[PDB]
Amino acid sequence: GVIVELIDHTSAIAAAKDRADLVERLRAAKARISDPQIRVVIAGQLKQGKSQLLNSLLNIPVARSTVLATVVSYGEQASARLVVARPDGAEPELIEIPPSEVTTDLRRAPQASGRQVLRVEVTAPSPLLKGGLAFVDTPGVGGHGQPHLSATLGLLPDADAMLMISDTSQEFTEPEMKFIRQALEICPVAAIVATKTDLYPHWRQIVDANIAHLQRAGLNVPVIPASSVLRSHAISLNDKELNEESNFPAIVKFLSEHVLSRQNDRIRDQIVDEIRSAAEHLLLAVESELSSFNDPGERERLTAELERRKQEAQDALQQTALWQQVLSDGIADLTADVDHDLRHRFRIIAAHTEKVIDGCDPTLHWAEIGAELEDAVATAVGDNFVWAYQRAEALAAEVARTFTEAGLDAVQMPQIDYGGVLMFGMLTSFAGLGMFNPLMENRMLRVRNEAKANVRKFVDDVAFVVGKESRDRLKGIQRQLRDHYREIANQTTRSLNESLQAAIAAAKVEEAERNTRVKELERQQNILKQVVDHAAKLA
């Protein structure tokens, strides 16, 4: 549309002036708006009907039972790739894979060569996904041998929305409620889908009750009833009649009005700012040369200024640069603080459990004791992760201000006279739910004491496991932010060095060909300004 033409124009200008850095930047911006990747996470516990919901939604059997996070996005032809982790927070690796593989256990897909597979990304030719919606199927959780529901939080920082699937067999359990509040801390745009309305006749009150609950508990989430079963019948008989009846259109409007529409506005704004910034980088050299022509007596101040801003832009690429110091020290600090937070939470949990143990015959309540512990530990991991996420955002925010405070992105004339692979995946704590089940005054003492001891290592082992991922995660964040600002510093360094020589080369021209040169600089200047002002307000 207008933006494409705008991008098109600007890019053309950047290429004739040999600004290869701006063209690629504009190439990335253009790529962002056609493949927006608007990720919507489909969450919820075991047996609630999530996968059937996704299949009924997209009309395609790509979804499945699943053991690995699966991202479904638009592609004319079916295709699939594995997102494979690299050590020490390095950028994950994409590995194409034949579609026949998605059906079974890529957790240890041979192509992965023993590395941890974070997720699978597959394509599907569903008219629903063309606009840029991408659905993240989550593995089975809440069951024996499965992750806790809070493990789903690891998918949300990179998500734009969440659909919380909760079936209508009974009202919300406490774990569902704690998870919803935690999820909203990271991903505010969310909705509850009350599934299986077709199977349970009293489904109605439960939705209202749950709805009550949220308001009473302060959780702002809309509830959308639905039946995947009716939808499936609907495809078959070509009956719209059933579709209003399935209430699936209600799911789409929320996806349209609260997810797709909200995010599209946000994508256009960042791309217009990208166009404006690129144009202004080009304008700097144009107006610097103009000043050198039209105002010869200020060449000293013009060049002295430009030289200063260039060095500062170059020093910003230094190990010692304040923004990089703040970043490096902040990540190191946050890493230690996050581990400290977790172990504080776990210690509180372990202490409670040990008291519980000394209060009964652990051998007569071991299943319930184990269950409470696994839930408490997994929830603490969730609370720790949310806290860590909030602190990382605050740190990232501080580094941006620090960068900005140095004028390392400023390209106005002096007045005189992440496109890489994301690292999001499931959280990890314990091997699985229901899997911690380890081996008169004397019997009781021996038994009670051993359980606790078993409990404290279990708690310690998880802290160990969680801490490594926390560490590599922060390293990944450090890498992404560093790459971002070194790129900007290089562009700014570049734009300032062109402006400097352009001002020098203009002072060597003679009277005969200055006026000819200026006129074309004003034509050029006017064009960028038209572009800048012209696209600045399509905000």
Residue numbers in the entry: 0 to 63, 69 to 421, 457 to 478, 495 to 594
What does the paper say about this structure?
We also determined the structure of nucleotide-free IniA at 3.2 Å resolution by molecular replacement using the GTP-bound structure as a search model. Overall, the apo state of IniA adopts a very similar fold as the GTP state, with a root-mean-square deviation of only 0.525 Å. An IniA dimer with antiparallel packing of HB2 was found in the asymmetric unit. However, we discovered no such interface but a HB2-stacking dimer in the crystal packing of our structures. Symmetric interactions of a D333α7–R351α7’ salt bridge and D337α7–H344α7’, E402α8–H348α7’ hydrogen bonds are observed between the antiparallel HB2s. When purified IniA triple-mutant D333K/D337K/E402K was incubated with liposomes, tethering of vesicles was not altered. However, when the HB2 was deleted, tethering could no longer be observed, suggesting a minor role of the HB2-stacking interface but a requirement of the HB2 in IniA self-assembly.
